[PDB]
């Protein structure tokens, strides 16, 4: 129905189940935006829109790591560690190399590729402690395998859709990879974490390197903080390429060295988070993190929301349709527009199994 | 020029120290200030060597995350110099200083006053700062070092408003944010906003009788503080977070209780230690309490010199047409000093046992 399509893991999916049954029983309340979005149709009792409607539950423009509670005021923890394995996917027409700021550069014919927003770990909050703290952390310390575990479960079904899709496409698949939950999801561990980012995606892609075989580059970029290296994991080059550290280094929504169109198709990572749609900051019109610039470089608001955006150079960002900005005093995001159009962010919802994907336990 | 820097008499001694350890001893300068000092034709004049150690700042710096804190940009002792160094600047304020799109523009546009103080660097990505060495005791956070930084680093701007307001006949509003408080603390992000509170609380109670005509400071880290209002001898003293307060009137404008007839409205900006006033924004990005109260104001107009042309439409202050005309993309006023050799340098005073000038010893 939509354009977008969400993906979650097994484990995923036995939490969403337990969930549901305590919920089914008696023995959990829900959360206000959870139980808010419920009170909108007409049942209880059926998985898929019970997901459906807890993703819906996501607000446009989310600080996750100052701005929730982690309690019924606004997600509950269940809640919150099951929205924080959900990753979504879609086909996107990149305007421009994906720079911050002003280092944009704008593609003479916009590159058609693919994203796949998925959620990074956690680690900071304004109240008390997370799900994802509480998942990775041994006694205050980051814990390698854990955190490892973490982002296989959150990243191998975005791997093995864009790998069948490669497939299809009698093509290969070239990820760009940002500093993943490096950002200002790692609250105190923001010093130790990229080492651990990094590890964890060789980590991953070493364990499942005979399940991707239509993966062939990954170019990693935490921007700063990791030495430049090139790896051989199986039959794929996993390339670390600080954007600060080697000058010159292609863009996070463009074709990486040893890709083009022709023979690969290029999908690129969002580090995402728990509680907003695939956007977050844009959604309140400023350009900003890696979900903010990559959102507004590409035609992601025009894909989520149905609408027809127009995409300026001379600002890098996709803007919102000259109709709804008509005739209203001063900047107006498209958070406007889809409170305007009381649009909802909901669509397909797929899990993997032991092998492909589905969406039924058994 | 537009701006005027100021700095503490603790910071007068921090830089004759280092001067004289230059002058003839065992301390080489960093790589930025070297290159600022190799432009020149002098050595051993303390006016001047302190404007160009300021000059070896850039237009952009990410101060939380770029910086090595040696010789490869700046020493510590460089570091903990530039850190105290606030600046001053007449500006004219367009719209309230909302970030994103949540901005309102004033219908006409205010004239009021800018300070931006660097707050504590609580955050690097490789070895420890000049102030988590200062202010941390074996990882904890020391309330009166904190207290003594932010003393420091905003009592000459508290007192140079105070003489200003005097001399309009009129009284100061002060706006202020969770300065040093966003990710700017690394570890301490989840501590450091009562401490930023009562920082502020203990400087303006410790310097009460000083700053007689400041009357109203309206301070508003938007989240993590209760709103409250206290009364500090004459002074109102308002914590008024804006995620859970709606309708405040915001940091670019005159708090409950003041307008322009009867207040002068200056606001303090959470500055770093090496980049230029505005910092995000020389790059063209409208964020932060920096970058954003930059762009809602002249400020880059006062820096530069230019006349740039607000735009409605954006919130921000913008490059004159004529240079913005023909180019590609977007285009940052860090271009516009790097094509036209803006360099960041004027007037810097010091404080005394009084008032400030600069005598020195
Ligand atoms: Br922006």
Redo the contacts between chains.
């Keep these: 129905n939509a354009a977008y399509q969400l993906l979650l893991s097994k484990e995923t999916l036995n939490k969403i189940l337990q969930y549901k049954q305590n919920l089914e029983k008696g023995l959990a309340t829900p959360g206000k935006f959870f139980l808010e979005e419920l009170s909108k149709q007409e049942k209880s009792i059926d998985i898929t829109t019970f997901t459906q409607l807890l993703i819906q539950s996501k607000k446009p423009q989310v600080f996750a790591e100052?701005?929730v509670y982690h309690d019924g005021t606004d997600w509950t923890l269940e809640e919150e560690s099951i929205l924080g394995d959900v990753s979504v996917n879609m086909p996107v027409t990149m305007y421009n190399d994906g720079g911050?700021?002003?280092?944009?550069?704008?593609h003479p014919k916009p590159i058609s590729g693919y994203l796949a927003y998925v959620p990074g770990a956690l680690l900071?909050?304004?109240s008390g402690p997370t799900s994802d703290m509480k998942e990775v952390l041994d006694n205050g310390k980051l814990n390698q395998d854990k955190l490892n575990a973490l982002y296989e479960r959150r990243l191998l079904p975005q791997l093995i859709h864009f790998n069948e899709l490669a497939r299809q496409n009698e093509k290969q698949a070239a990820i760009t990879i940002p500093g993943i939950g490096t950002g200002?999801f790692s609250?105190?561990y923001?010093?130790v974490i990229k080492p651990y980012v990094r590890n964890a995606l060789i980590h991953i892609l070493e364990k499942h390197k005979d399940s991707l075989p239509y993966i062939d580059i990954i170019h990693y970029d935490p921007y700063?903080?990791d030495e430049p290296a090139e790896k051989k994991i199986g039959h794929m080059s996993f390339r670390v390429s600080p954007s600060?550290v080697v000058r010159g280094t292609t863009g996070q929504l463009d074709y990486p060295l040893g890709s083009n169109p022709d023979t690969h198709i290029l999908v690129s990572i969002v580090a995402w988070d728990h509680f907003s749609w695939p956007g977050n900051?844009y959604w309140?019109?400023?350009?900003?993190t890696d979900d903010g610039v990559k959102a507004a470089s590409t035609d992601t608001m025009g894909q989520v929301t149905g609408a027809t955006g127009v995409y300026d150079?001379?600002?890098?960002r996709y803007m919102p349709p000259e109709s709804f900005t008509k005739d209203r005093?001063?900047?107006?995001?498209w958070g406007?527009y889809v409170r305007e159009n009381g649009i909802v962010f909901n669509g397909p919802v797929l899990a993997l199994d032991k092998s492909g994907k589905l969406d039924t336990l058994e």
Excluded: I, L, P, T
């Design positions: 100052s701005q911050h700021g002003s280092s944009f550069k704008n900071a909050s304004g200002c609250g105190a923001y010093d700063m903080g600060g900051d309140g019109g400023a350009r900003q150079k001379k600002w890098g005093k001063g900047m107006s995001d406007d």
